Design a protein around this nucleic acid. Structure first.
Lengths: 157, 69, 97, 27, 117
RNA sequence: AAGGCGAACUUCUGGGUCAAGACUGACGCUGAGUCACGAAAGCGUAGGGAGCAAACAGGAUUAGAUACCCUGGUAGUCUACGCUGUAAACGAUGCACACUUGGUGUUAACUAAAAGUUAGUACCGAAGCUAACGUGUUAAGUGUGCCGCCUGGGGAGUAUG
RNA sequence: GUCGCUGUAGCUCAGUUGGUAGAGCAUAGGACUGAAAAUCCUUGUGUCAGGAGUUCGAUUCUCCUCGGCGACACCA
């Protein structure tokens, strides 16, 4: 209720391999059990494997584009007026965009069938790069579910 | 029969702003929402009673606030 | 779910036990499909009985009722009637649409 | 007024009217 | 394949549905569309967005009747009647007049009774 | 007078208000029985019946729904005549007269009009009154005339006539 | 015996004068409500009854059957 939350930490723009905040955030979302080193190693190895499965030098480029292929635009939030619940569409914010994307890739990769760690996650990452797989399917499902219910778009309060 | 003739160079936006305003100044929509379904003359009279009482209390209230200040 | 009748400092006549059951079949036509548990605690403390009924609803509502009386049959009648009425009231709360 | 007294009168009137309706058409 | 040039567009916008008819100046109907026909159902049928879609679909139905010159007629209290006119404008077909034919009785035909007696 | 009375016109017809503007000269007030009128619903006879709508039917909500909601729908709602004479028929305050500070609107008349008066009609409010709420020149204030009505609650506006 | 026809998703129904295998209901999953409902969304469900021929290829075009049809005429 007392809004305007305190300024986020935001200071962890990982100064290890890329000086990029988005990789750090992805590793953090990856974490189980409180094991940052394990997450960092898995993510680094997996993105390397992706960059040599697509054989480009710049790994930032392919990683970022495979993220942006899943970052959504409009999502469904439920409100209710007059004892009637309506699933109104609403435009997400950019931070929530990265969050939803990373969550979707992570869930699909974890629940997929694979042999090993970076194996599962690199495979899922290139599927996203090629705009196909569970993560992209979920993203497009959310997109056009919101679009199939655009009538209530005038409820944005 | 409320009309708004649209000129050759006139813009659609203000055209239907004029339409909306003179509709509201004919009170067509309020009349229709009033005639949607029947009301006892008793309850018309009573709601007018109560509306005027609310108006009087609100005015006395407003003047009290003005003098209190 | 089926109701849990507990007692403290007292001994259950089978008459009063199946009396309680006979008062509780009122729930399993209307309310049973809406509740998690229904507990009925009897206590005998001051030459009198103290009854605590308790119900949990599937939508997060909790109903409690405490009563005292002198005669177990009368106390059970009043307390179970109050419990059933309050449960009906909450069900209607939610189903009013 | 509290209105309980008016309610009492109302239920009395209903019972009396019901009695008369019951005993109508009887002869 | 015919050319009319002039025409009328009737729009009924009630609390439940929106119906858009495209007709001659004489009034003979060329085509029509409705929110119920546009796939909506339930409360969607009366939102302004559905009114916009219904109207523009109705006009797209009649793109090739050689008309660019319409009189708009409106009745009903529906929320998005302005949206219906706005979409008619957005399609590019120019309007020459906007009217209302909402029937206002002189106190006849006692209306329905209230809800929740 | 109350119930009540709102598209337009005519005919028939009731009542009120003001005045120097003359006449009668207390011819008045109230009124037990009695008589007349009396919303809506209902009844009899004969018409009419668009819309609305008890009863009733179907569809939903619900454990059930003889209801609230939805789709239909017969009386009734309307007209003429003859009955019924009941309402929270209320201002929950009977009628009439003689008096008792003001404020703010409003209707009609007299005045060319303002400005004021008179007869109404609303809000606020001094004193007074009131158990309190409130009332307060349209008293529930100060006085009286006459009529109606009340004497703890239930039984009971019942039983019986 | 004859005439008019059909058989396509679990059901109903399209199917284009030949190059699609789908529409609605239902099934299963996600989301929504407190559940049941109703949206909303995904998702399966085929030698298109069988065979021959026509076509470069055939649910479709023809023909021959299989099973089920509706309707008509005889019935010693």
């Amino acid at each position: 209720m007392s809004r305007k939350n305190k300024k986020i930490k935001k200071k962890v723009f990982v100064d290890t391999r890329y000086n990029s905040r988005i990789v750090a955030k992805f590793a953090n979302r990856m974490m189980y059990d409180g094991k940052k080193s394990i997450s960092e190693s898995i993510l680094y190895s997996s993105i390397d494997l992706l960059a040599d499965k697509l054989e480009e030098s710049d790994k930032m480029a392919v990683f970022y584009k495979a993220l942006d292929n899943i970052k959504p635009l409009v999502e469904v939030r439920s409100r209710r007026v007059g004892g009637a619940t309506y699933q109104v569409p609403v435009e997400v914010r950019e931070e929530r965009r990265e969050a939803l994307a990373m969550k979707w890739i992570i869930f699909a990769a974890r629940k997929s069938s694979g042999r090993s760690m970076k194996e599962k996650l690199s495979n899922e990452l290139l599927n996203a790069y090629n705009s196909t797989g569970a993560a992209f399917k979920k993203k497009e499902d959310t997109h056009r579910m919101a679009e199939a219910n655009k009538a209530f778009t005038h409820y944005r309060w | 029969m409320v009309t708004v003739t649209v000129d050759k160079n006139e813009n659609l936006e203000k055209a239907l702003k004029r339409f909306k305003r003179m509709i509201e100044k004919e009170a067509i929509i309020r009349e229709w929402k009033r005639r949607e379904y029947y009301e006892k003359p008793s309850t018309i009279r009573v709601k007018k009673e109560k509306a005027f009482k609310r108006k009087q209390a609100k005015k006395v209230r407003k003047l009290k606030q003005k003098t209190n200040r | 779910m089926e109701p849990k009748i507990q007692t403290v400092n007292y001994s259950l006549n089978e008459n009063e036990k199946n009396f309680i059951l006979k008062k509780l079949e009122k729930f399993d036509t209307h309310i049973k499909k809406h509740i998690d548990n229904l507990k009925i605690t009897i206590k005998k403390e001051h030459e009198l009985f103290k009854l605590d009924a308790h119900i949990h609803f599937n939508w997060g509502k909790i109903i409690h009722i405490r009563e005292d009386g002198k005669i177990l049959l009368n106390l059970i009648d009043s307390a179970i009637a109050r419990l059933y009425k309050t449960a009906t009231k909450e069900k209607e709360k939610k189903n009013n649409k | 007024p509290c209105g309980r007294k008016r309610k009492l009168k109302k239920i009395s009137t209903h019972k009396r009217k019901k009695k008369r309706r019951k005993n109508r058409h009887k002869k | 394949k015919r050319n009319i040039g002039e025409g009328n567009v009737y729009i009924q916008a009630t609390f439940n549905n929106t119906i858009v008819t495209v007709s001659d100046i004489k009034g003979n109907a060329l085509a029509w569309a409705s929110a119920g026909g546009m796939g909506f159902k339930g409360a969607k049928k009366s939102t302004p967005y559905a009114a916009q879609i219904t109207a523009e679909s109705a006009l797209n139905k009649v793109r090739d009747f050689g008309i660019n010159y319409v009189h708009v007629y409106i009745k009903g209290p529906g929320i998005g009647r302005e949206s219906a006119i706005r979409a008619i404008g957005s399609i590019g077909m120019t309007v020459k007049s906007i009217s209302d034919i909402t029937p206002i009785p002189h106190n006849g035909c006692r209306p329905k009774k209230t809800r929740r007696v």
